[PDB]
Design a protein around this ligand. Sequence first.
Ligand SMILES: [Mg+2]
Ligand SMILES: [Mg+2]
Ligand SMILES: [Mg+2]
Ligand SMILES: [Mg+2]
Ligand SMILES: [Mg+2]
Ligand SMILES: [Mg+2]
Ligand SMILES: [Mg+2]
Ligand SMILES: [Mg+2]
Ligand SMILES: [Mg+2]
Ligand SMILES: [Mg+2]
Ligand SMILES: [Mg+2]
Ligand SMILES: [Mg+2]
Ligand SMILES: [Mg+2]
Ligand SMILES: [Mg+2]
Ligand SMILES: [Mg+2]
Ligand SMILES: [Mg+2]
Ligand SMILES: [Mg+2]
Ligand SMILES: [Mg+2]
Ligand SMILES: [Mg+2]
Ligand SMILES: [Mg+2]
Ligand SMILES: [Mg+2]
Ligand SMILES: [Mg+2]
Ligand SMILES: [Mg+2]
Ligand SMILES: [Mg+2]
Ligand SMILES: [Mg+2]
Ligand SMILES: [Mg+2]
Ligand SMILES: [Mg+2]
Ligand SMILES: [Mg+2]
Ligand SMILES: [Mg+2]
Ligand SMILES: [Mg+2]
Ligand SMILES: [Mg+2]
Ligand SMILES: [Mg+2]
Ligand SMILES: [Mg+2]
Ligand SMILES: [Mg+2]
Ligand SMILES: [Mg+2]
Ligand SMILES: [Mg+2]
Ligand SMILES: [Mg+2]
Ligand SMILES: [Mg+2]
Ligand SMILES: [Mg+2]
Ligand SMILES: [Mg+2]
Ligand SMILES: [Mg+2]
Ligand SMILES: [Zn+2]
Ligand SMILES: [Zn+2]
Lengths: 91, 69, 114, 149, 50
Amino acid sequence: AKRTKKVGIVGKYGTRYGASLRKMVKKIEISQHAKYTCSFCGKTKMKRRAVGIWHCGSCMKTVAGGAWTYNTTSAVTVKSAIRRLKELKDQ
Amino acid sequence: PRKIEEIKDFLLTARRKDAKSVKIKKNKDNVKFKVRCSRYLYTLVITDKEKAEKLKQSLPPGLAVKELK
Amino acid sequence: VQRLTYRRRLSYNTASNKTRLSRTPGNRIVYLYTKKVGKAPKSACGVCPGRLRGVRAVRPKVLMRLSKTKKHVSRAYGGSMCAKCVRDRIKRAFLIEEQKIVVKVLKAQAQSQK
Amino acid sequence: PGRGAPLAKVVFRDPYRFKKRTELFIAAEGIHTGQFVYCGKKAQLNIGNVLPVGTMPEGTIVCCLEEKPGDRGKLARASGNYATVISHNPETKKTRVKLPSGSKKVISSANRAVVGVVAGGGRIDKPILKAGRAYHKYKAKRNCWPRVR
Amino acid sequence: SSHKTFRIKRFLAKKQKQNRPIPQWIRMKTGNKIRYNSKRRHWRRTKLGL
RNA sequence: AAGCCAGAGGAAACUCUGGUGGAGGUCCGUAGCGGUCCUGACGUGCAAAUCGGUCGUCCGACCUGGGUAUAGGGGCGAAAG
RNA sequence: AGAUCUUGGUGGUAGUAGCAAAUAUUCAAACGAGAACUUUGAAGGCCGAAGUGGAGAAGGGUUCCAUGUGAACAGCAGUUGAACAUGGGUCAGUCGGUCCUGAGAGAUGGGCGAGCGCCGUUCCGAAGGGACGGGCGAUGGCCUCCGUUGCCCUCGGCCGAUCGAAAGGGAGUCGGGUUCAGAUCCCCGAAUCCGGAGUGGCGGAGAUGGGCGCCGCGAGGCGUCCAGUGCGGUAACGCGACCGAUCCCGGAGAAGCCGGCGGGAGCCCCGGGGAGAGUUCUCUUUUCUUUGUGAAGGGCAGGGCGCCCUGGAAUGGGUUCGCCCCGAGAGAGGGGCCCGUGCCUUGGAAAGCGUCGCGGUUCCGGCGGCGUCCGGUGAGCUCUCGCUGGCCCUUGAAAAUCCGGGGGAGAGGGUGUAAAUCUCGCGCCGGGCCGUACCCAUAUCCGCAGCAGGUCUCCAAGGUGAACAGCCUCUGGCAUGUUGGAACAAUGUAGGUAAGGGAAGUCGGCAAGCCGGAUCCGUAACUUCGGGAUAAGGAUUGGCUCUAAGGGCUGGGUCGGUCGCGGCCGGCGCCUAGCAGCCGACUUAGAACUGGUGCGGACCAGGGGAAUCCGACUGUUUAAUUAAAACAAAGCAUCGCGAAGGCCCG
Ligand SMILES: [Mg+2]
Ligand SMILES: [Mg+2]
Ligand SMILES: [Mg+2]
Ligand SMILES: [Mg+2]
Ligand SMILES: [Mg+2]
Ligand SMILES: [Mg+2]
Ligand SMILES: [Mg+2]
Ligand SMILES: [Mg+2]
Ligand SMILES: [Mg+2]
Ligand SMILES: [Mg+2]
Ligand SMILES: [Mg+2]
Ligand SMILES: [Mg+2]
Ligand SMILES: [Mg+2]
Ligand SMILES: [Mg+2]
Ligand SMILES: [Mg+2]
Ligand SMILES: [Mg+2]
Ligand SMILES: [Mg+2]
Ligand SMILES: [Mg+2]
Ligand SMILES: [Mg+2]
Ligand SMILES: [Mg+2]
Ligand SMILES: [Mg+2]
Ligand SMILES: [Mg+2]
Ligand SMILES: [Mg+2]
Ligand SMILES: [Mg+2]
Ligand SMILES: [Mg+2]
Ligand SMILES: [Mg+2]
Ligand SMILES: [Mg+2]
Ligand SMILES: [Mg+2]
Ligand SMILES: [Mg+2]
Ligand SMILES: [Mg+2]
Ligand SMILES: [Mg+2]
Ligand SMILES: [Mg+2]
Ligand SMILES: [Mg+2]
Ligand SMILES: [Mg+2]
Ligand SMILES: [Mg+2]
Ligand SMILES: [Mg+2]
Ligand SMILES: [Mg+2]
Ligand SMILES: [Mg+2]
Ligand SMILES: [Mg+2]
Ligand SMILES: [Mg+2]
Ligand SMILES: [Mg+2]
Ligand SMILES: [Zn+2]
Ligand SMILES: [Zn+2]
C-alpha cells in the first residue's frame, strides 16, 4: 500500500529539519538517486558515483555532469550556444 | 614429501647420490619404502607383499635399509 | 572448550595478524597465520572491470618464484590485456589505417583539378 | 576531496620524446571518458577543448581561464562557474571577459581556457540539513567549521 | 618491556651487577668506615632513571 | 523511508489493500563513553575527586591506542577564562 | 621565652581513633619450638567465558626459577612471600626490529641574521660518479678465449640528502618431544624463502626434420642442399621450460562505513559403537570424560566468474530474501579460468592421545596389548571466503618491492650428438647484528604504598532467555581482598516490612513506592502529516494430555520378443485431480483436564495524563561545587577580495 502521504523519500529524516527544508531536499535527493538512461549504450544504468560524476554500469562510461542531476539546464544551454557560435565562426 | 607412483622411478631415485637412507614400514594394508633425499622424502606404496620383498632384495647396496618394525 | 592465544607478540586484530584454526596431530586447536588474499591483474585497457583469466592470483612478491606460464596467457598482450579489448584494438588499428588510406586516395583524386 | 568540481585525468603524447603525459584538467560539464580533447591555437570550439581566448567568438563562455598568458588555469575553477568572453581588440592583443563575480577583466588574448562550464552543477542548492554533514564537508577541507560567535 | 634496545639492556645489566651487598672481608680492612652498601636499590621501592 | 511484487477499483490521471525491502546525526537497552539526582556514602577517605544506587548517550558532530604538529602574553578552545 | 622563628628531639592525646567496599569458611594430618593465616587431603562456597581463566602491547627490570634464613619489611601472624641471601635462567634465515613511506622532521644550494644560528625542502645549484651497449688501447692471465682496468662515444629527470610505524606496506616454519625456570628459537622429523656458483654441477628443453643423388631385396646407411629462438585448442585458454637490451605501457602492493544473503571451517547439539570413571535405598541398556592428522605437494569435491562456442528470444523470458539481467545476445546445451583454508593421499603413525599391563637405568622420548569407529542435524555462535546492494557538498594513504605486456637494438650454428639461451626437474654452499625470562594488574605499570582510582588488545562452554542481559553450572582459578574471637546496647551505614489514612510531610513527591516482558485488542488532542505512540485503557500468561498447520530426499513403467535369475533395442502402457516409502528442525494456533486464582511466580523489566517557560532537534561545556535556558548547529543575512589580491603569521 501507499506508506506515506507526502514526505516520500524524506521520510527517513523524521520530524527534523523543518518541512520546507525537507521539501526542498526531496526533489534533489530524488534526482540524485535516480537512474538515468545512458546516452551511449541506451541502458537505464547511469547513476551518480560522486558529486558531479555519473557512471554507467553497463558500458563503464563516466561523464562529468551536475551535482544532483545528470546534466544541468545551464550546461545544456551552454552546449547549444557553443555549437551555434562554432557554426557561425566557420563557413 | 613426494609420492613415487611406480617402481622404476623409485629405483632411480634410490640410486641417487643424495639418497641418505631408505626406511621400510610394514603397515596392515601396504608396505611403504621411504627414501630420504636432499630435499624430499620419497614414498613408494606397495599394496601386496611379494613385490615389496622383491624390491627389498633389489634395493641398491651402500645404502641404509632401515626397517621401522 | 579450548580457548586460543596468539602465537606472536602482535596482539592486535590488524590486517597482518589474521589467523585460521588448525587441528594438529597432537589433537589440539592452534592458530595458523594466514597469508593475504592475492588479486588477479586488471586489464590494461582500464575499461572492463573483470580481472584477467589464466593468471594465478598471488601476492606480488610470490610472482617472482612462479614460472612464466603461470603469469601470462599465450596471446598478444596476454596477461596484461583482456581478449575482448585486444580484439577491439586489432579491429580499431586496422580500420583506422584503412581510413587513412581512404582519405589519402580521396585527396589524391581531388587534387586532379586546378 | 575538498572541491566540488570533478577532475578529469587526460593523457597526452609527449611531442619530443616517447612518453605519455598525464594531465589533471578541471572537468567541464559534458565531457566523458574515452573522449578526445584538443588543446592549442587551432583547436575547435567544443566542450573540453583548450584554446586561447583571442581565437574565440564574442559570446563564448569558458571554464578554466588563465589570469596571465602562460600560467595554468586560475579563474572560474569552482564547480558550476564560468567566465564569458565579451570583447576583443586585435591591436594590443587584449580580450575583455566577465568573471563569475560579475567583474570585468582585461586579459591577454593568449590566455587559454576550457570551453564550457565546469561540472559539479548546483551543489549549493541542496540544504546541508545537519551539523554532521557540515562536519564531514569541512573535515576534508580545513579546520574552520565550528564557528563561535 | 620485552622489546628493548641493546643500550637499554646494557644499562640494566650494569644496574643489576652493581645492586649487590658488600663483601664480608671489606669490614676487616684497616680503617674501613663502611658498614653496608648504602646504594642498594629495590625494583619496587625506587625506580631507575630511564 | 525510498525502491519492488501481486490483487482490486478507475475512461484516464491515478487510487486502495496485502506483502517485500531495510533508511535514519531513529527509539528501548548491554559493552564503551559520560556524569543527573540522592545535595546518599566518605569527608585526618580506598581516593589531594573515590564508591553505591539512579541516570544521559550508545552508527555517529561515536569511543579509543600509538605516531605527529602547535609553547607562555604564546598555544589551543562546539567558548566554561 | 617568644618572631604561626630554624633544625633536632620528646610528651599529653592514647593503648585511643582505627585495622568494617566487592556472600565464607570448616574438619583432619604433616613439617615445625611455635599454626585462624603454610602445605596436603576432604567438605562448603565464589569468579561464571564481557572471568577472580589463558596470552600479549606500553611500562617495570630480574620482580622469573631452585635452595636456605626468619633480623628488618609484608599496618595481626606466618613454618609463607614480588623480603633477605646464595646460585641459575632469555638460543631464530622463515617471531619482530632491521627495509619502505605516511602525517611530519630535516641538511646542502640560496636567503636572512650582530651572533649562537634559522628560513626554506625545490625554491636563486654546473645537483646524474651509473649503465649489459660500441670503439681506442695497455695481454694484466690457462697469451684458444673470456674475465681485469684507463680513456672516448652513446644512453641515463625518483627534480632531490637523510630520518620518520616492534598496530600501516613487507618473500619465506610447521608437527611432536623436552626444563626447576627457554623454546614456532633447543632436540627429533617434515618443509620453505632469498642470495651465489667464475673454472659452467647433472638432466630436460631449444633440437635435432624434409628434398635430391647413390648404395642397399626391403628396412637402413653415405654425400649434398634446405629449414629449425617450442607446441596444442574455433575460442575462453592450455602444456615443463619456451632467446632478447636501452626504452615505453600496465598490473599487484593499494584501500571507507553499513546492510542482506550464500559456501567453508571451529565450537555447540542429537543418535549409536568402544575405553575409563560416577550412581545403584529403588529406578536408570543410565550420567560424565575421551574417541588426532601440521606446513608443503598431487588429485577431487565445493564456491565464484562482467570468460568462450552454438544459437537467436513477445504469447517476453530468466531470476533474487531484496534485486537485477537480456538483439551491445536472454533461456538452453557444451566448455574455459580463479579460489580451493574442505575431502583423500605423501607427510602418517613410527608420532600423539585413551586405556590395560610388564621390566627396570636412584630421575627410561623404556617395552608390550587393544582402541583412536559410524552417523545426523541447524535463520545456532565465532572466524573466514564470496556475491549483491545502500550512504557520502565525507569518495576513504604513500613508497619500497615484485610481475606481465609492447618493441626488436642484438646474440647464437651450419646440419653438429650442435650453438646462444632457459621463469623446467634434481643437486651444491650461505643467511651476519639486536630483542626474546617474568608481571601485564583489587600485589611486578602510574597514582609517595601490596592504594576500591587509572592503563591498549586477542580467545570465549552448558541451562534459561530476544540476547556478549541478569541468575545457576563445567574447564580454569581463587580464599573473601592489609587481622581474628565473643556478644547482638544506643547512634549509624546498606537492605526490607508495616494496620487505617494517602503528600495532611516538605521550599519542592526529595527519597521510596507504583508500572514493567510477551500475545490479543484498543489508542486522543495536536502536528512540520514524518510523528505523538509502548499514548491512554483492557484481557491473557502455570502444569499436563493431545489436535492441526507450516518441509526435505529418493522411486512412479506396458513386458524373457531373452543370456550381457542379469544387460543393448523394441511390438511392449497411461502416475499427467499425483502417488509410495524414508527422514527431519523449530514455530504458531486451537482443545480438554488440572492446582487454595496461582502462573513475565527468581532474574530481566517504561508510572501515567493536562498544561506554562526556554532551547528547534542530535551534539558540546566549566577534569575537582554550575550539564543549563549557556556554546555549537543547519537555515537566514551582511561584509571584503579577480592574485601586484582579501584575511592572517613573521
Ligand atoms: Mg607490521
Ligand atoms: Mg586439515
Ligand atoms: Mg556560531
Ligand atoms: Mg610503582
Ligand atoms: Mg540514536
Ligand atoms: Mg537512545
Ligand atoms: Mg553528598
Ligand atoms: Mg565570566
Ligand atoms: Mg629557646
Ligand atoms: Mg579500638
Ligand atoms: Mg574495625
Ligand atoms: Mg556462581
Ligand atoms: Mg586476562
Ligand atoms: Mg617467585
Ligand atoms: Mg606484621
Ligand atoms: Mg631481592
Ligand atoms: Mg638528476
Ligand atoms: Mg627509515
Ligand atoms: Mg614460559
Ligand atoms: Mg591426514
Ligand atoms: Mg545463458
Ligand atoms: Mg599408536
Ligand atoms: Mg615469554
Ligand atoms: Mg589497585
Ligand atoms: Mg612519582
Ligand atoms: Mg590487596
Ligand atoms: Mg565479607
Ligand atoms: Mg580472611
Ligand atoms: Mg501503611
Ligand atoms: Mg494500606
Ligand atoms: Mg503541603
Ligand atoms: Mg506544613
Ligand atoms: Mg525520585
Ligand atoms: Mg503523551
Ligand atoms: Mg492452560
Ligand atoms: Mg537543547
Ligand atoms: Mg525555533
Ligand atoms: Mg567533558
Ligand atoms: Mg564541575
Ligand atoms: Mg555536575
Ligand atoms: Mg528562522
Ligand atoms: Zn551506458
Ligand atoms: Zn578490457
